[PDB]
Write a protein that binds this DNA or RNA. Structure first.
Lengths: 362, 364, 469
DNA sequence: TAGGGTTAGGGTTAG
């Protein structure tokens, strides 16, 4: 089978894409160009865009606009175009003060050092960094930065040759990146694998259904009536894990369904989306987002800075607001419900937050 | 442990059931309406039993309870009581709210790279207990946990805290070398360390700042003079500061490194005399700021130095992750950019950059 | 206005329809391809006024044109095979190759006749072309696709907005009629009224109603520069708002009916002694913000509540909008999208040399910079604000350098003078804008050209003439 | 109430 290349949208997820890869010159010559985008190559699925080589110069050719070199890395020979930087509008030196004169002298010394560092002849050692290109059926490297390595004992090349196989084995000979792991989207049909995962997906499915209908109040038995939610919950995992009764198979399945719905509802209540009142109904819930009276009361409380003195700094802390609401509105208020109410109030441009967990009136 | 009360006296019944209302019986304000109270008497004494007699109960003398790392490092955890065993790293005194900030490295059998944490001891209990010294192993129980403005996690010290010292500091402080990793391993979220070294190669420079600030009010000075002198500072003292933002890579991944103070001179590859001369020159105007990328002979010299191959050199860097392990705020979705190689722009999903902090820079 | 009902108006055919007057259009193919948004004003009977409305148009179909070859040529060898070319042959080759390769499940085709008279050679003046239409969800074909019967293909990369504007004969801002609107369960815009049309064919043009009044705001701000990072922060700002600005007569007198001012403090310095008492005694509606984040939040809330359509000022695009966006990003002020009209999460990249992201930052609203309009209209020695005031209104304006800005916090009188100077600068900007009749001229130019109204204020004459052609 | 201020930056050609 022809190994399909990685999609052009997930290339950036690989860390190797933005890093100067260390590769053998033979590999550089042997990698196959990618059809999706010219100029970007592939090695074992890794989209490689830039390279880093070190070798011995074996040939120098000069034109009017660029240099040419042949880098030999004891595995292959490749060209390395080095463009010429135009020295237009050279900096003019002036007989300024003594400190400025010393600065200009140091600048001239630095320029001389750079010019010495960039001088290359046959037989030296060069390090070239850049991007691969193809020109007239020839593969060559358009150098971005390059300099002459001063290596009088042959330690750098020995270290490079000892190091390259390890980096190959530990990084380059590995399968691919991690793009949404493996089937992280959905859970491989509603059957899934983990029962709590099924509970969670049912939970926010029910949350979405309740939001889209604009439900003010609802019951758990009402949520049970929903055929779609029941079908989503009706999976082999829950049925196989609920065979605790023989004479009451349907009854125990219904009890397990009730338990999983209760777990979903308590998960929603933990997020504060739904809150309960002591009205005698164990399965009655009210959507926090739709409670307009709670929003009005919270805004009224905030407008007076939670009854704090005016000379005290304006605004209130999250804990102070929670305590005032508990003492004034309802002792049973939860933190998540208050946070959602505050966020909804801020969305409608009612209050402005100055610090984090701090809110003020207009 | 199992303790036996050996209260002497007559065999009066009920004496070990509840406190007599009509007799001497007092309770703390936090235990006003307790259903079970038993005030100990002065003549009463305590004794310790043997292990063999109560081996069944004493078989539960396992490790003291410890909250799960997920519970400890989750902001949604409403419970404000946690317990753990850690080793004290450094202890410092805070003065204006007197506090003794403690930095403890956790010890657990779940994660092999435990995170760091801060323990604050405030005024109500500030003859801090003996043994709390760097290098020792201490077990903390029932600490209050709170989340700060910057989403950090730090544990306070409340009246319901029990502290036990386990081992004394070692006589000799042995040294340990930092692990050697590739920069790609930090982008795979499976148990990666946050303090390691790597052999990176400098690529470019983003910015560079040099100051001469006042020693008291931290305001920019000019020729050793505070801008607000006579209103916030009593003398004329000037100190130097420096920032720089590199951009390094090591053949596997890309990262941006921030350095401060003398690490700036270390990264620029300048001798101390040249660094001193540069700072003395900078002392004249007051500030030097360059923004090479992002939203005068001195300027030209710095521009030439920041792009020459004298700076863009291979180095060995010992770095620490900028985002502290205690901090918790994972909210980053992948972005979308427009790299263009062959005169044919394309769109790719890119990860957010890695932010690091320097600790040491050496040549190679 | 409740969101459960739409202000439907009965039509001639005894069918209720949606009526509104669009101003600006937005398109986003990367996230929601084949969707074009429209913004404008809709008459409301309950209050006898106009409110902002957002209209959603879906299911925009791409169009492709194929040129049949004269004689069959094999792709592999570039040589004839001995058979002529027929339309059915082109259709069969397309169905058997392109649909399979590029995964195009659904498409519609029919023979059409078209003319070509442009620079691309190897194209006859008059011929018969193959028109293939399919939804935008399927991947776009390459621009250089060549086959055994078609040499060149046209319309590969036509934007949805351009196709929608071209195929419905819409010429600038004009009244529209939408047939059978549907309510949206999930709000996506900050406007009061929302509706969506299933197909583009349900939109027509009505040309018998005068344009309605708009809402215009002029604003300006003072920025001081930090000394440790060369960053520009915000200290104070002010604005003026009019509610019934007409677009077919002279500017209303007075040009403004309401205003507000907000002043903040730097990180280091503090307010002058009894500054709040001084403000209260003078009885001036000035709101004091503790930090920069409070100021940004207050400004965004005021913008959202007032709901302006046209925002004007001096040197907005070059400096002010970029500075405001950078400060919003740094201060992490939530809900940055209120500066526009469509709910968005990811802010566009800043620092763009072409400013494309900065231009797109305020989709749905109008940004009118007096500098570009002045450059287009009249000639002056310079286009600075003081020079413009001197040459147009013949009045002197005080210039406050950045050096004194730090010192103005010593006394309350200096702070009040600075705030009054900012207010006067904003008023001068508004008066200069009203003097040159920029808005009616822009409306006439857009109606003549037919392009989008917002792009007219950018000075892109080439864009207007390209749209006209 | 406990980290300072905070965010994000280069991403192309020349024969």
């Amino acid at each position: 089978r022809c190994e399909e290349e990685t999609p052009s949208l997930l290339w950036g997820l690989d860390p190797v894409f933005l890093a100067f890869a260390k590769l053998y010159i033979r590999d550089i010559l042997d990698m196959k160009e990618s059809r999706q985008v010219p100029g970007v190559f592939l090695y074992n699925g890794h989209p490689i865009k830039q390279v880093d080589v070190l070798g011995t110069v074996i040939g120098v050719r000069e034109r009017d606009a660029f240099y040419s070199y042949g880098v030999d890395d004891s595995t292959g020979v490749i060209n390395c175009i080095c463009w010429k930087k135009l020295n237009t509008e050279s900096v003019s030196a002036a007989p300024s003060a003594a400190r400025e004169l010393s600065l200009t002298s140091q600048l001239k010394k630095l320029q001389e050092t750079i010019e010495q560092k960039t001088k290359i002849e046959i037989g030296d050692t060069i390090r070239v960094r850049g991007s691969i290109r193809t020109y007239r059926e020839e593969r060559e490297i358009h150098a971005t930065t390059y300099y002459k390595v001063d290596d009088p004992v042959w330690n750098i090349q020995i270290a490079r040759m000892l190091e390259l196989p390890t980096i190959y084995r530990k990084v380059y000979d590995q399968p691919f990146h991690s793009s949404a792991l493996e089937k992280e989207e959905a859970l491989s049909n509603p059957g899934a694998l983990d029962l709590p995962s099924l509970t969670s997906l049912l939970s926010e499915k029910a949350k979405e259904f309740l939001m889209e209908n604009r439900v003010q109040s609802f019951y758990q038995q009402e949520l049970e009536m929903v055929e779609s939610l029941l079908s989503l919950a009706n999976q082999p995992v829950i049925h196989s894990a609920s065979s605790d009764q023989v004479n009451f198979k349907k009854d125990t399945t219904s009890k397990a369904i009730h338990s999983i719905f209760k777990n979903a509802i308590q998960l929603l209540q933990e997020k504060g989306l739904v809150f309960q009142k002591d009205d005698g109904f164990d399965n009655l819930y009210y959507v926090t987002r739709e409670d307009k009276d709670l929003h009005r009361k919270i805004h009224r409380i905030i407008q007076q800075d939670c009854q704090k003195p005016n000379h005290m700094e304006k605004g209130c802390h999250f804990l102070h607001i929670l305590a005032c609401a508990r003492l004034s509105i309802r002792p049973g208020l939860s933190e998540a419900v208050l946070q959602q109410v505050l966020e909804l109030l801020e969305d409608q441009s009612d209050i402005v937050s100055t610090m984090e967990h701090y809110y003020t009136a207009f | 442990q199992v303790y036996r009360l050996v209260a002497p006296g007559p065999a009066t019944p009920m004496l070990f059931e509840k406190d007599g209302s009509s007799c001497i019986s007092r309770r703390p304000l936090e235990l006003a309406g307790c259903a079970s109270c038993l005030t100990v008497q002065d003549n009463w004494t305590l004794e310790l039993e043997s292990s063999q007699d109560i081996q069944d109960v004493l078989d539960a003398n396992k490790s003291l309870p410890e909250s799960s790392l997920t519970d400890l490092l989750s902001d949604n955890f409403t419970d404000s009581l946690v317990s753990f065993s850690a080793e004290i790293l450094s202890r410092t005194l805070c003065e204006p709210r007197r506090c003794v900030k403690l930095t403890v490295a956790l010890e657990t059998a779940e994660c092999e790279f435990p995170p760091h944490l801060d323990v604050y001891i405030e005024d109500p209990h500030l003859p801090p207990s003996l043994g709390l010294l760097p290098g020792a192993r201490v077990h903390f129980s029932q600490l209050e946990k709170r989340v700060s403005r910057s989403h950090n996690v730090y544990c306070c010290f409340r009246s319901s805290t029990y502290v036990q010292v386990l081992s004394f500091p070692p006589e000799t402080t042995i040294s340990v070398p930092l692990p050697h990793i590739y920069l790609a391993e930090l982008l795979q979220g499976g148990q990666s360390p946050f303090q390691a070294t790597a052999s990176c190669h400098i690529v470019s420079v983003f910015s560079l700042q040099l100051f001469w600030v006042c020693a008291y009010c931290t305001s920019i000075c000019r020729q050793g003079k505070c801008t607000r002198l006579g209103s916030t500072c009593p003398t004329q003292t000037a100190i130097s500061q420096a920032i720089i933002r590199l951009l390094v890579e090591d053949g596997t991944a890309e990262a941006v490194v921030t350095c401060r103070n003398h690490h700036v001179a270390a990264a620029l590859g300048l001798c101390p005399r040249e660094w001193a001369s540069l700072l003395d020159f900078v002392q004249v105007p007051g500030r030097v700021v360059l923004q090479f990328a992002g939203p005068e002979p001195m300027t030209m010299f710095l521009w030439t130095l920041c792009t020459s191959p004298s700076v863009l050199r291979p180095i060995v860097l010992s770095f620490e992750l900028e985002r502290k392990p205690s901090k918790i705020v994972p909210l980053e979705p992948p972005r979308l950019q427009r790299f263009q190689c062959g005169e044919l722009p394309f769109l790719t999903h890119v990860n957010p950059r890695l932010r690091l902090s320097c600790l040491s820079i050496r040549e190679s | 206005v409740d969101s459960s009902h739409l202000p439907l108006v009965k039509g001639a055919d005894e069918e209720q329809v949606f009526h509104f007057y669009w101003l600006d259009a937005y398109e986003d193919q990367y996230n929601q391809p084949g969707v074009v948004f429209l913004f404008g004003k809709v008459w409301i009977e309950s209050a006898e006024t106009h409110v902002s409305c957002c209209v959603m148009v879906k299911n925009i179909e791409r169009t492709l044109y194929f040129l049949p070859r004269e004689m069959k040529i094999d792709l592999n060898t570039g040589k004839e095979t001995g058979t002529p070319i027929s339309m059915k042959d082109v259709y069969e080759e397309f169905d058997e190759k392109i649909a399979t390769k590029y995964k195009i499940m659904k498409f519609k085709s029919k023979p059409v006749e078209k003319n070509y008279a442009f620079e691309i050679p190897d194209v006859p003046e008059k011929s018969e072309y193959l028109e293939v239409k399919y939804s935008a969800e399927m991947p776009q074909l390459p621009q250089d696709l060549k086959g055994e019967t078609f040499s060149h293909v046209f319309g590969t990369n036509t934007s949805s907005l351009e196709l929608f504007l071209m195929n419905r004969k819409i010429k600038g801002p004009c009244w529209l009629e939408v047939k059978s609107p549907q309510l949206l369960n999930q709000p996506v815009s900050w406007c009061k009224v929302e509706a969506m049309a299933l197909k583009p064919d349900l939109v027509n043009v009505i040309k018998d109603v005068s344009p309605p009044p708009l809402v215009v705001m002029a604003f300006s701000m003072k920025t001081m520069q930090n000394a440790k990072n060369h960053q520009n922060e915000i200290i104070a700002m002010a604005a003026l708002v009019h509610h019934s600005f007409a677009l077919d007569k002279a500017a209303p007198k007075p040009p403004f009916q309401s205003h507000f001012c907000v002043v903040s403090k730097p990180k280091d310095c503090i307010f002058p002694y009894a500054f709040k008492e001084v403000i209260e005694k003078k009885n001036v509606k000035v709101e004091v913000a503790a930090t920069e984040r409070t100021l940004l939040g207050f400004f965004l809330a005021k913008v959202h509540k007032i709901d302006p359509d046209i925002i004007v000022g001096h040197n907005i695009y070059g400096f002010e909008l970029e500075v405001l966006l950078q400060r919003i990003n740094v201060c992490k002020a939530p809900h940055w999208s209120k500066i526009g009209r469509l709910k968005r999460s990811n802010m566009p990249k800043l620092g763009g040399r072409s400013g494309f992201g900065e231009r797109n930052a305020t989709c749905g609203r109008m940004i009118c910079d007096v500098e570009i309009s002045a450059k287009e209209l009249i000639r002056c020695k310079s286009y600075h604000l003081s020079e413009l005031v001197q040459q147009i209104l013949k009045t002197e304006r005080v210039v406050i350098p950045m050096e004194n800005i730090q010192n103005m916090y010593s006394e309350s009188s200096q702070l009040l003078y600075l705030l009054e100077h900012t207010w006067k600068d904003a008023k001068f900007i508004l008066q200069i804008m009203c003097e040159l009749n920029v808005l009616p001229l822009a409306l006439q130019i857009t109606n003549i050209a037919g392009n989008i109204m917002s792009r007219t204020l950018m000075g892109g004459r080439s864009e207007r003439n390209e749209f006209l052609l």
